């Protein structure tokens, strides 16, 4: 069973932010336009018995003072009440400013992603679903006491905490254009959550981490945080060859109980960032290559969204990821028309109204040797036994 998180209230909240507007509606409506919803099990967002239960859940990671501030920000924006100088200073102390400003539903909006991803984790734990998709989740930058990169609450960290707290190891794979710093930091000292981010890094590029400083964890979590920074311009094939052996080696050595994949769509060639040149093509899209490989491991998996600022092309990609997941999990052939079906947001898919995006297409060897060494160090530190040459052969 492949699950997907949605709901009427969830849709309105996921569409209430100024930065991401109606992206989630385009995504879910295109999935619906392609007749995928009857193939999927709807997973409703988690709700709580009381304010105290909600607060307990969110402060499993975030600080009480930060959650207090995020609630107050919504309350202030809920009225005409412009912030006092003291309130501005309070918000600044949590980076609830500039790129992460307040809006009338900022706490409800960020809490909704947490509700969705926690529900997804529970459905995996109870084995109701083999894979769960949450295209309203994936906010990998939020820190314990700091908003960052349009992320206010870290739904990923809270979902992973629910998985490991259910011997359990989690592999987190972050495919976003940006380094998954918030998730990496949360599990820096934890050997049982191994994090792996592939991303662009360059001077002045957000958030700045995930590159040479390589730090890789600390304490009992030493060697447990993996990173592969790539230069601008990389295409589907080169990105696939860069991460492919790393993914397979992580699965062999870690033997994870769960995999959590952040599938931010800002690596697409048509994203306004214009840094990587990945596609959604399925003849092959780097995203689909990676997701297909992860799903072949037959490990219960959470697939999350993230970045993606070209909303129709994000919808194009995530619709294909959803169909691929159905096909790989259920063994059911999926046939998506190359033409965008008529539906509410059909006019947004100009100019050609095709499902393919409108695009025409040894430093990594050193990184591979470095990561192989780090994997061996992780395995030694943690008394894990693994076929050294079967893993080296992957590269
Ligand atoms: C969780 C994924 C979506 C939101 C975060 C993310 O992964 N995004 O896609 C980037 C895009 C971008 O340009 N930023 C950014 C740049 C500079 C500054 Cl200062 C703050 C934010 C992000 O956070
Ligand atoms: C020092 C600090 C730390 O975390 N450790 C450690 C202990 C046990 C294991 Cl298994 C791994 C690391 C030290 O020895
Ligand atoms: K990433
Ligand atoms: K870790
Ligand atoms: Zn991003």
Residue numbers in the entry: 2 to 167, 177 to 223, 233 to 302, 316 to 393, 402 to 435
According to the publication:
Indeed, several studies have demonstrated the role of HDACs in the life cycle of Schistosoma; class I HDACs (smHDAC1, 3, and 8) were found to be expressed in all stages of Schistosoma lifecycle, with smHDAC8 showing the highest abundance. We showed that mice infected with schistosomula knocked down for smHDAC8 transcripts showed a decreased number of recovered adult worms and lower egg burden, suggesting that this enzyme is a valid therapeutic target. Therefore, small-molecule smHDAC8 inhibitors represented a promising approach for the treatment of schistosomiasis. SmHDACs, and in particular smHDAC8, warrant attention as they are validated targets and are of potentially high therapeutic value in the search of new small molecules for the treatment of schistosomiasis.
J1036, bearing an n-pentylhydroxamate group and an N-(4-chlorophenyl) substituent, showed the highest inhibitory potency against smHDAC8 among all tested compounds. To get molecular insight into the mode of action of the newly identified inhibitors bearing n-alkyl substituted hydroxamate moiety, the crystallographic structure of the complex between smHDAC8 and J1036 compound at 1.55 Å was determined and refined. The electron density for the inhibitor was not perfect but its binding at the catalytic zinc could be unambiguously assessed. We observed only part of the inhibitor structure in monomer B. Here, the hydroxamate is interacting with the zinc ion and the long alky chain is located in the foot pocket, indicating that the compound is partially hydrolyzed under the X-ray conditions. This is confirmed by the observed binding of the cleaved capping group of J1036 in a noncatalytic smHDAC8 pocket. Analysis of the crystal structure of the smHDAC8/J1036 complex in monomer A shows that the inhibitor binds in the smHDAC8 active-site pocket, where it forms specific interactions with the enzyme. The internal hydroxamate group is coordinating smHDAC8 catalytic zinc ion in a bidentate fashion. The n-pentyl-hydroxamate group additionally interacts via hydrogen bonding with three residues, namely His141, His142 and Tyr341. The J1036 n-pentyl moiety is deeply buried in the smHDAC8 foot-pocket, underneath the catalytic zinc ion, where it makes non-polar contacts with smHDAC8 residues Phe21, Trp140 and Cys152. Finally, the halogen-substituted phenyl capping group of J1036 forms parallel-displaced π–π stacking with Phe216.
